[PDB]
Design a protein around this ligand. Structure first.
Ligand SMILES: CC(=O)N[C@H]([C@@H]1O[C@](OP(=O)(O)OC[C@H]2O[C@@H](n3ccc(N)nc3=O)[C@H](O)[C@@H]2O)(C(=O)O)C[C@H](O)[C@@H]1NC(C)=O)[C@H](C)O
Ligand SMILES: CC(=O)N[C@H]([C@@H]1O[C@](OP(=O)(O)OC[C@H]2O[C@@H](n3ccc(N)nc3=O)[C@H](O)[C@@H]2O)(C(=O)O)C[C@H](O)[C@@H]1NC(C)=O)[C@H](C)O
Lengths: 229, 228
């Protein structure tokens, strides 16, 4: 289109167990979710920035940092089984149905992403739009150990390999593996709405360099890295 | 009985040249392993197995022994860690009449290694006769079953596409070797017993203490190492 409509949706549900109130817990000098909102603003490639949440405290924080909160996320998709795509589809359909706004491209930006680089958000959009075959672009990172040589542990702590054939295989002889970094996901609006699979041959990645923020301890480590220069 | 450390530190590399002695926070990588082994106090001897004279000199400078030059054929890009340890144990038996009981393979690129973990690994090994090895491991933070690969044009595919929409908590947990240490009964090493097998236990490390792909990883780790 001649007029761009690229939007950011930040999913954030309440109810975290391991880190209570995780999305509004202070990280450095701001509630954690604010770092994602601010990265989307700084990027400068979003027409709108929306938080999708069922939680009143999270919504209030979102408005404070200049995200929109146009709706309350339906209760049925704020649960332990709803997927990222379901949350993003809801938001896109809401914009279409309630405001007559049809976005072009839609970026899902997770709420725990203080190390996200704003330029990477716009890099992702440029990659998405550069290759017309492409339906999604997401942040990914390499595994630092060959997944083919992974182990499991039984309840008595005894080791076995997932693939014992690779006991003595060299790391450099195995196919390189990557994983979703859980930061951002660009998609064509229709890719989201048609529930197209993200990890598939119509998707590219932006590769990030070598953070877990899953535990209270992890939070403390990240605080230190955040201010390193 | 006689518990020793063997640090296998060849001159060649799969990727980063001279990684075993590259400076990490202002000392050669191998120095942090030697210092940890000495601090741990549970080794009768600390031996570096190397083909490379530069590495030998670093090993001697930090107070490890270099009793032999490792033969070249077990310092190439294909020889396994176990073959290096077997060579060293057989050398000790045949050349010095020394018969170790437990042998710790301690890698040279493990600057976060903790002395207390080295001694704990020995205590675990020697509490059960069925246990042949104990090594340092850590959990994968992301489910390996949802891993992807990239083609030469950057397009994504899953290793296991059936797990596209599967929750992390519905997949079995996976771990990996942390590349720090491996305690083994001497005969386990000599008999070429597999390390990743049901006669082996681990010492689980929080992944924050298991480290380097890039020059930038290298710089970052150095700085975190200082804030650890
Ligand atoms: C126990 C086990 O499975 N370990 C895995 C290792 O993987 C490899 O790791 P690497 O990074 O190439 O080598 C690890 C360290 O050992 C030294 N080194 C190594 C070999 C040698 N002949 N002489 C040395 O001196 C080398 O210089 C380096 O410091 C890899 O494939 O890259 C290869 C290792 O030989 C080992 N593999 C097996 C089946 O032993 C892995 C960590 O799980
Ligand atoms: C695109 C993709 O595959 N992503 C993977 C995700 O995995 C999971 O990650 P998570 O950490 O549980 O949730 C990610 C973020 O979304 C929030 N959240 C989540 C759900 C919701 N209904 N409402 C929210 O608001 C949650 O609080 C957190 O901030 C996991 O299984 O752990 C679950 C995700 O639903 C998603 N899985 C799929 C197939 O979409 C993975 C990263 O590769």
């Amino acid at each position: 289109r001649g007029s761009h409509m690229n939007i950011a949706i930040i999913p954030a549900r309440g109810g975290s167990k391991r880190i209570p109130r995780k999305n509004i817990k202070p990280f450095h000098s701001k509630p954690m979710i604010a770092w994602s909102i601010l990265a989307a603003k700084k990027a400068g490639c979003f027409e709108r920035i929306i938080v999708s949440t069922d939680d009143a405290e999270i919504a209030a924080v979102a408005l404070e940092y200049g995200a929109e909160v146009p709706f309350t996320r339906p209760a049925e998709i704020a649960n332990d089984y709803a997927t990222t795509g379901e949350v993003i589809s809801h938001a896109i359909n809401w914009l279409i149905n309630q405001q007559g706004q049809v976005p072009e491209n839609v970026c899902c930006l997770y709420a725990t992403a203080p190390f996200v680089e704003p330029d990477d958000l716009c890099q992702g959009l440029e990659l998405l739009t550069f290759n017309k075959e492409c339906q999604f672009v997401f942040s990914a990172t390499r595994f630092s150990f060959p997944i083919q040589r992974a182990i499991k542990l039984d309840e008595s702590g005894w080791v076995s390999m997932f693939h014992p054939e690779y006991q003595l295989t060299r790391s450099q002889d195995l196919e390189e593996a990557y994983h979703d970094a859980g930061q951002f996901y660009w998609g064509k609006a229709n890719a989201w709405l048609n529930k197209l699979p993200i990890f598939a041959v119509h998707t590219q990645v932006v590769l990030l360099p070598s953070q877990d923020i899953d535990t209270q301890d992890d939070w403390l480590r990240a605080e230190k890295l955040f201010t390193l220069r």
